[PDB]
Design a protein around this ligand. Structure first.
Ligand SMILES: [Cl-]
Ligand SMILES: [Cl-]
Length: 124
């Protein structure tokens, strides 16, 4: 199995682009990251920052997670992100996503040793 840290990297990191540049970004990335293999993953966010900047969020503002957990952290600054969500015209295996680029603070849940992001919670 994939470790929790590696799964977070695979699903959310995209340090190779500064931002989504086309409406087809989500369709291409969801496929490239294998998120449309067994089913169409309904929602997913990609972060366009270096891995080190994202891992550093685990040392930033500690805030509560929606589920009540207390290992969530919010980034002090805004980051370049792309939210990908299936449209109503999406049916596996023909997955289709709406791409929405934005600059916002991210919230992640951290764990382990080293203590790194394991779950993408939300953006503000
Ligand atoms: Cl994979
Ligand atoms: Cl997500």
């Amino acid at each position: 199995k994939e470790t929790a840290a590696a799964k977070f990297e695979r699903q959310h990191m995209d340090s190779s682009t500064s931002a989504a540049s086309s409406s087809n970004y989500c369709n291409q990335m969801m496929k490239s990251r294998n998120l449309t293999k067994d089913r169409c993953k309904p929602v997913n966010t990609f972060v366009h920052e270096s891995l080190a900047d994202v891992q550093a969020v685990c040392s930033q503002k500690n805030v509560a997670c929606k589920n009540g957990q207390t290992n969530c952290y919010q980034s002090y600054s805004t980051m370049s992100i792309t939210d990908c969500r299936e449209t109503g015209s999406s049916k596996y295996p023909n997955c289709a996503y709406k791409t929405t680029q934005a600059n916002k603070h991210i919230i992640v849940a951290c764990e382990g040793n080293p203590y790194v992001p394991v779950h993408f919670a939300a953006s503000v």
